[PDB]
Amino acid sequence: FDPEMLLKLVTDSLDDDQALEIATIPLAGKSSIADYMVIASGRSSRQVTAMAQKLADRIKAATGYVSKIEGLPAADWVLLDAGDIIIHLFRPEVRSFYNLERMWGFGD
Amino acid sequence: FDPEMLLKLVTDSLDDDQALEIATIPLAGKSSIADYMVIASGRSSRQVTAMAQKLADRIKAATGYVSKIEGLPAADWVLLDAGDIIIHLFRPEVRSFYNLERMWGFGD
Predict the structure, then answer these.
(1) B28 touches chain A (CB under 8 A)
(2) Any idea of the CA torsion for B88, B94, B98, B100, to the nearest 10 degrees?
(3) β A36-41/A68-70 pair status
(4) How many independent structural domains does chain B possess?
(5) Scanning every residue of chain A, which has its alpha carbon at the shortest distance from the alpha carbon of B61?
(6) Is any Cβ of chain B less than 8 angstroms from the Cβ of A73?
(7) DSSP string covering A10-75
(8) Testing the interface with B: which of A24, A36, A66, A78 to mutate, by most B Cβ within 10 A?
């Protein structure tokens, strides 16, 4: 399964699930971690969760690849590691809030 | 604390701890998640762990920011979320192996 085909699956799925700000970062000549990183926002916890889970299910259906998901059920963010592509999903207002708390030195 | 200053701290720290393939991805005009993503490799579990922990300690010492670390103590990868910068660390031979297992459909 071609990494460009995987990229198309990822962005099509996120677009279908109404993600915003879907960014594609090509990593050729920069990093060996993956061919692409994709980053996108969701508007709620239900939405980020549905987004991530459907994407993992779709990748498995299309390719057989079992993606690693980091950050569920508490879904302020999700990372989905699909091997050739790593997908970052975030809730902008939750992230800005948590970043402030960490800037203030909370939590150690 | 300036995001360019934070970037310099991150890359200087990773360089000092002998990370390889240190990639800087500017996100201006692409994603709101952060100003930069940094990706780098380490050669062992001790090294990736030392790398990530020292970077978190250094960010806190220099800025007060308490970074969120994902993927320790089992350190095949680490993500360090420093707010304005997200840092991905990976062990190339471990990642290639785990990616194969997921490609083969292991683990659900």
Answers:
(1) no
(2) 110
(3) unpaired
(4) 1
(5) A105
(6) no
(7) HHHHHHHTT-EEEEEEE-TTT-SS-SEEEEEE-SSHHHHHHHHHHHHHHHHHHH----EEES-SS-
(8) A66
**Radius of gyration of the CA atoms of chain A, in A:** 14
Method by which the coordinates were obtained: X-ray
Experimental structure resolution, Å = 1.8
Q: The domain spanning residue A46 has which CATH number?
A: 3.30.460.10
Q: How far is CA B95 from the centre of its chain?
A: 14
Integer Cα distance of B65 and A14 in angstroms? 31
Q: Is A41 exposed, middle or buried (0-12, 13-18, 19+ CB in 10 A)?
A: buried
Residue A108 at interface with chain B, using a CB cutoff of 8 Å: yes
A79 contacts B32? CB cut-off 8 A:
no
Could you tell me which chain A residue has the CA closest to the CA of B94? A33
**Which residues in A12-27 are b (16+ Cβ under 10 Å) and which e?**
ebbeebebeebbebeb
Tell me which residue range forms the domain holding B14: 1-108
